[PDB]
Amino acid sequence: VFKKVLLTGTSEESFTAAADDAIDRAEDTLDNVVWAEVVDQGVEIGAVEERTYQTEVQVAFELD
Amino acid sequence: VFKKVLLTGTSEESFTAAADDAIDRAEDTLDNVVWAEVVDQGVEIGAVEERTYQTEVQVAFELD
Amino acid sequence: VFKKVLLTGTSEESFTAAADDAIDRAEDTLDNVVWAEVVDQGVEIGAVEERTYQTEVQVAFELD
Amino acid sequence: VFKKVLLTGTSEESFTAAADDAIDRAEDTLDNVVWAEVVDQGVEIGAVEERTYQTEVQVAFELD
Amino acid sequence: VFKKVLLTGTSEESFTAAADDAIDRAEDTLDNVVWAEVVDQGVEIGAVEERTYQTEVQVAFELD
Amino acid sequence: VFKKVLLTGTSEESFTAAADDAIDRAEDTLDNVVWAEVVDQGVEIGAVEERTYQTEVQVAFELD
Amino acid sequence: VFKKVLLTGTSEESFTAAADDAIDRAEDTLDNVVWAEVVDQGVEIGAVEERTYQTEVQVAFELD
Amino acid sequence: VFKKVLLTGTSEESFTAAADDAIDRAEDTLDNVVWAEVVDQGVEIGAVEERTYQTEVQVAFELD
Amino acid sequence: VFKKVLLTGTSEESFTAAADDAIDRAEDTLDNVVWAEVVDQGVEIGAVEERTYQTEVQVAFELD
Amino acid sequence: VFKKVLLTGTSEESFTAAADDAIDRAEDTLDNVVWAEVVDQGVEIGAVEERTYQTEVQVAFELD
Amino acid sequence: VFKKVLLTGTSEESFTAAADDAIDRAEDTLDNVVWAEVVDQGVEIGAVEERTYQTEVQVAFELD
Amino acid sequence: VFKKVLLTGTSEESFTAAADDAIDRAEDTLDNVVWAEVVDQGVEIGAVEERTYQTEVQVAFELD
Ligand SMILES: [Cl-]
Ligand SMILES: [Cl-]
Ligand SMILES: [Cl-]
Ligand SMILES: [Cl-]
Ligand SMILES: [Mg+2]
Ligand SMILES: [Mg+2]
Ligand SMILES: [Mg+2]
Ligand SMILES: [Mg+2]
Ligand SMILES: [Mg+2]
Ligand SMILES: [Mg+2]
Ligand SMILES: [Mg+2]
Ligand SMILES: [Mg+2]
Ligand SMILES: [Mg+2]
Ligand SMILES: [Mg+2]
Ligand SMILES: [Mg+2]
Ligand SMILES: [Mg+2]
Ligand SMILES: [Mg+2]
Ligand SMILES: [Mg+2]
Ligand SMILES: [Mg+2]
Ligand SMILES: [Mg+2]
Ligand SMILES: [Mg+2]
Ligand SMILES: [Mg+2]
Ligand SMILES: [Mg+2]
Ligand SMILES: [Mg+2]
Ligand SMILES: [Mg+2]
Ligand SMILES: [Mg+2]
Ligand SMILES: [Mg+2]
Ligand SMILES: [Mg+2]
Ligand code: NA
Ligand code: NA
Ligand code: NA
Ligand code: NA
Structure with a gap:
C-alpha cells in the first residue's frame, strides 16, 4: 500500500x-x-526579497 | 516547506x-x-435532523 | 439506487x-x-434589481 | 461581446x-x-489578524 | 470533522x-x-511477475 | 436525440x-x-454492515 | 429554480x-x-451511412 | 510575451x-x-428573439 | 480493441x-x-493569410 | 523515453x-x-447481445 | 482586491x-x-531557430 | 493535419x-x-540511484 503526502x-x-x-x-x-x-x-513575489519558486508535489511512500 | 491536510x-x-x-x-x-x-x-440532508453544510478544504501549514 | 437532478x-x-x-x-x-x-x-447582476446569488447542485435521492 | 476580468x-x-x-x-x-x-x-489565516475569506470570480461585462 | 488520507x-x-x-x-x-x-x-506490468491492479482512494475517517 | 440520467x-x-x-x-x-x-x-464503509461498492453512471437512452 | 437536462x-x-x-x-x-x-x-462514423455530428448540451429550463 | 483576454x-x-x-x-x-x-x-434561448450561439475564447496577442 | 489517434x-x-x-x-x-x-x-490568426479554424479530435478505430 | 498508446x-x-x-x-x-x-x-448496452464493459487505458511502453 | 492577468x-x-x-x-x-x-x-520547435520554452502564468496584483 | 504522440x-x-x-x-x-x-x-525516487525528473509531453508534428 502506498500513501501520499501533499507538500509544497x-x-x-x-x-x-x-x-x-x-x-x-x-x-x-x-x-x-x-x-x-x-x-x-x-x-511568490510580494512577500519575499527574492522571487521564490514553489512546486507542490504528492510524495508517495510505501507503507510497511 | 508547506504540508496540506484534507479536512471536511x-x-x-x-x-x-x-x-x-x-x-x-x-x-x-x-x-x-x-x-x-x-x-x-x-x-447532508437524509442522515441528519437539520441540513448540514459541508465544506472540504486543503489546510496548509508550515513545517518547522 | 440513487438518482441526481441538476438544479440551480x-x-x-x-x-x-x-x-x-x-x-x-x-x-x-x-x-x-x-x-x-x-x-x-x-x-446575476445585470438582469436583476438586486444581485442574485446562484448555487447549482446535484441533488441525490434514493429510488424506491 | 462580453469580456471577463479575473478578480479575487x-x-x-x-x-x-x-x-x-x-x-x-x-x-x-x-x-x-x-x-x-x-x-x-x-x-487567509497566517498573514492576517482575522481570518479572511476570499472568493475569486470571473466578472463578465458587455463591451460597448 | 472528517479527514482523508490518500492511499493506493x-x-x-x-x-x-x-x-x-x-x-x-x-x-x-x-x-x-x-x-x-x-x-x-x-x-503495474513491467516491475512485477503478475500484473498488479492498483486503485488509489481518498479514505475518509471521522475525527474524535 | 439521446438523454442521460445520472444514477449511482x-x-x-x-x-x-x-x-x-x-x-x-x-x-x-x-x-x-x-x-x-x-x-x-x-x-460506503461506516453506514453499512458490509462494505458497499458504488459506481455512478450517466445512462444514455434514445428518445422516441 | 432552474433544472438542466443532459441531451445529445x-x-x-x-x-x-x-x-x-x-x-x-x-x-x-x-x-x-x-x-x-x-x-x-x-x-459518429462507423454505424452510419453519412458522418453524424453530435453535440451534447445541458439544457436549462425555469421551474414553475 | 503573449497576453490573453477572455471574450465571449x-x-x-x-x-x-x-x-x-x-x-x-x-x-x-x-x-x-x-x-x-x-x-x-x-x-441563449430565453432572453432573445432568435437563438444566439456563443463561443468564449481566450484571444492571445503579442505584447510589444 | 479500439485505438485512438490524436489529430488536429x-x-x-x-x-x-x-x-x-x-x-x-x-x-x-x-x-x-x-x-x-x-x-x-x-x-490560427497571425501565421496565416485567412483565419484558420482548428479542431483537435481523438479518432477511434477498431483493431483487427 | 516512454510512449503511451490510448486503447479501449x-x-x-x-x-x-x-x-x-x-x-x-x-x-x-x-x-x-x-x-x-x-x-x-x-x-455498451444497445449494440450488443450481452452488456460489454469497456475500460480505456493509456498503455506505457519503454522506447529502445 | 486582487486581479490576475494571463501571460505567456x-x-x-x-x-x-x-x-x-x-x-x-x-x-x-x-x-x-x-x-x-x-x-x-x-x-515551440518549428517556428524558431532554437527551441523556446514557454510558461503561461496567471499573474496576480493588488488593486489600489 | 497535425498528429500528437504522448511521450515521457x-x-x-x-x-x-x-x-x-x-x-x-x-x-x-x-x-x-x-x-x-x-x-x-x-x-522517480525509489527505482533509481539518482532522482530522475520526468516530463510527459504531447509532441505535435505536421503530417505530409
Ligand atoms: Cl482567465
Ligand atoms: Cl490530496
Ligand atoms: Cl449531469
Ligand atoms: Cl492522448
Ligand atoms: Mg540565488
Ligand atoms: Mg496551488
Ligand atoms: Mg441553527
Ligand atoms: Mg466531496
Ligand atoms: Mg435582501
Ligand atoms: Mg454554471
Ligand atoms: Mg467581523
Ligand atoms: Mg486560487
Ligand atoms: Mg491470482
Ligand atoms: Mg495515479
Ligand atoms: Mg456478498
Ligand atoms: Mg461521487
Ligand atoms: Mg446532408
Ligand atoms: Mg461524450
Ligand atoms: Mg439569421
Ligand atoms: Mg460559460
Ligand atoms: Mg474560404
Ligand atoms: Mg490545443
Ligand atoms: Mg459471460
Ligand atoms: Mg470514453
Ligand atoms: Mg541559449
Ligand atoms: Mg497553452
Ligand atoms: Mg547529474
Ligand atoms: Mg503521469
Ligand atoms: Na492529501
Ligand atoms: Na443530469
Ligand atoms: Na483572464
Ligand atoms: Na495519444
Whole structure:
C-alpha cells in the first residue's frame, strides 16, 4: 500500500529545485519514498526579497 | 516547506462556517496554519435532523 | 439506487441560501432526498434589481 | 461581446461577501457588469489578524 | 470533522480488490473509517511477475 | 436525440456489479437504453454492515 | 429554480445544428427553456451511412 | 510575451461565427492578435428573439 | 480493441469542417474508423493569410 | 523515453477484464510494456447481445 | 482586491526562466505584483531557430 | 493535419531537460515536429540511484 503526502517545496532558483525541497523534507521523515507527482507550480513575489519558486508535489511512500 | 491536510468541516448554518469548522480543528492540532483552499462543498440532508453544510478544504501549514 | 437532478437555486442573500432554494424545490417534488453536491456558483447582476446569488447542485435521492 | 476580468475579493465575514467585494470593485471601474462566475474560494489565516475569506470570480461585462 | 488520507491499494485480482487493500490498511490504523472515493486506477506490468491492479482512494475517517 | 440520467448503483461485490445495478434500474423504467459512462466510484464503509461498492453512471437512452 | 437536462443532439450537417437538434427536442416537451451549455462534441462514423455530428448540451429550463 | 483576454462572442448563425465575433472585436482594439483558444460554448434561448450561439475564447496577442 | 489517434484538423471555413479534415486524414490511412471525440478547438490568426479554424479530435478505430 | 498508446479494451465480464483486454493487445504488438493508466470506463448496452464493459487505458511502453 | 492577468513568457533556457519572462513584463507595467500561478507549459520547435520554452502564468496584483 | 504522440522524457537534471529528452526522441524518428505541450511532471525516487525528473509531453508534428 502506498500513501501520499501533499507538500509544497520552495526554491529561489527553479521549479525543479522547489520539487527537490519538498522531496528532501519527505525523505527526512519518511521511510521508503518512491515517487512524486507535480500537482501545482507557482511563484511568490510580494512577500519575499527574492522571487521564490514553489512546486507542490504528492510524495508517495510505501507503507510497511 | 508547506504540508496540506484534507479536512471536511460541517455546519448547520453555512458553507463559510463549515470551512471554519475544519480550520478550527486544524489549528487545535497543528502549528503554523497559514491558509486553506476550498475543494468541495455539499449538504447532508437524509442522515441528519437539520441540513448540514459541508465544506472540504486543503489546510496548509508550515513545517518547522 | 440513487438518482441526481441538476438544479440551480437562487437567493438575494447568500450562496448557502441559494443551495437551500434548490434543495427545498427538490424536497417539494421528490421523496427521499439524501444529499446535494455543489457543482457551480455564480451571481446575476445585470438582469436583476438586486444581485442574485446562484448555487447549482446535484441533488441525490434514493429510488424506491 | 462580453469580456471577463479575473478578480479575487476578500471579506472577514463570508465567501458571499468576498464575491461581493470583487463585484463592487468591478462596478466601480466598468460599465455594464452583467454576471460573475465563482472559480475558486480560499481562506487567509497566517498573514492576517482575522481570518479572511476570499472568493475569486470571473466578472463578465458587455463591451460597448 | 472528517479527514482523508490518500492511499493506493494493490491486488493481483481486480480493481475492486485493490480498493479493498487500501481500505483494509486504513482500518488497521485508523478509527472511524466512513467512506472512500476512487481517484485513480492503474496496472503495474513491467516491475512485477503478475500484473498488479492498483486503485488509489481518498479514505475518509471521522475525527474524535 | 439521446438523454442521460445520472444514477449511482450499489453492490456488496464489486464496482462492475454496482454499475450493473444502476443500469438494471434504468432498463426497468426506460426504453432504449444504449450505453453508460462511469463518472465516479466509491465505497460506503461506516453506514453499512458490509462494505458497499458504488459506481455512478450517466445512462444514455434514445428518445422516441 | 432552474433544472438542466443532459441531451445529445445529432446532425449530418454541423456541430451547431446538432446543438439545435437537442434544444428543439427540449422545447417540444418543456416549458421555459432558457439556455444551453455545450459539454461535449463528437462524430459518429462507423454505424452510419453519412458522418453524424453530435453535440451534447445541458439544457436549462425555469421551474414553475 | 503573449497576453490573453477572455471574450465571449455571439452569433445568430453558428458557433464558428460566434468565435469570429469575439476575434473581430479583439482585432478592433488590439495589435498583434495571434491565436484564440475556445474555452466554452453555449446558446441563449430565453432572453432573445432568435437563438444566439456563443463561443468564449481566450484571444492571445503579442505584447510589444 | 479500439485505438485512438490524436489529430488536429484545419479549415478556413468552420470548426465542423476542421473536424472533418482530421477524420478524412485518419480514413486515408486507417481501416475501420468508428468515431471521433472533440478535445479542443482553436483559431490560427497571425501565421496565416485567412483565419484558420482548428479542431483537435481523438479518432477511434477498431483493431483487427 | 516512454510512449503511451490510448486503447479501449472490452469484456463481457468486468472492468478489470476489459483493462486486461487492452493490455493483452498492447503486449501482442509492443515490446517493453511497463504500465497502464485507466482514463475512462463505460458499458455498451444497445449494440450488443450481452452488456460489454469497456475500460480505456493509456498503455506505457519503454522506447529502445 | 486582487486581479490576475494571463501571460505567456518565453525563454530559450528553461520553463523557470519563461515564467520569469512573464513576471518581469507584468512588473514593468503593473504596481503591486504579488504572486503567479503556472497554468500551462509548452515548447515551440518549428517556428524558431532554437527551441523556446514557454510558461503561461496567471499573474496576480493588488488593486489600489 | 497535425498528429500528437504522448511521450515521457527523463532527466537526472531538471524538468526542462526531461521535456527535451522526449522532444529529441520525437525528432529522431519524425519529420516536421512543430511543438510540444506539457501534460504531466513527476520524479522517480525509489527505482533509481539518482532522482530522475520526468516530463510527459504531447509532441505535435505536421503530417505530409
Ligand atoms: Cl482567465
Ligand atoms: Cl490530496
Ligand atoms: Cl449531469
Ligand atoms: Cl492522448
Ligand atoms: Mg540565488
Ligand atoms: Mg496551488
Ligand atoms: Mg441553527
Ligand atoms: Mg466531496
Ligand atoms: Mg435582501
Ligand atoms: Mg454554471
Ligand atoms: Mg467581523
Ligand atoms: Mg486560487
Ligand atoms: Mg491470482
Ligand atoms: Mg495515479
Ligand atoms: Mg456478498
Ligand atoms: Mg461521487
Ligand atoms: Mg446532408
Ligand atoms: Mg461524450
Ligand atoms: Mg439569421
Ligand atoms: Mg460559460
Ligand atoms: Mg474560404
Ligand atoms: Mg490545443
Ligand atoms: Mg459471460
Ligand atoms: Mg470514453
Ligand atoms: Mg541559449
Ligand atoms: Mg497553452
Ligand atoms: Mg547529474
Ligand atoms: Mg503521469
Ligand atoms: Na492529501
Ligand atoms: Na443530469
Ligand atoms: Na483572464
Ligand atoms: Na495519444
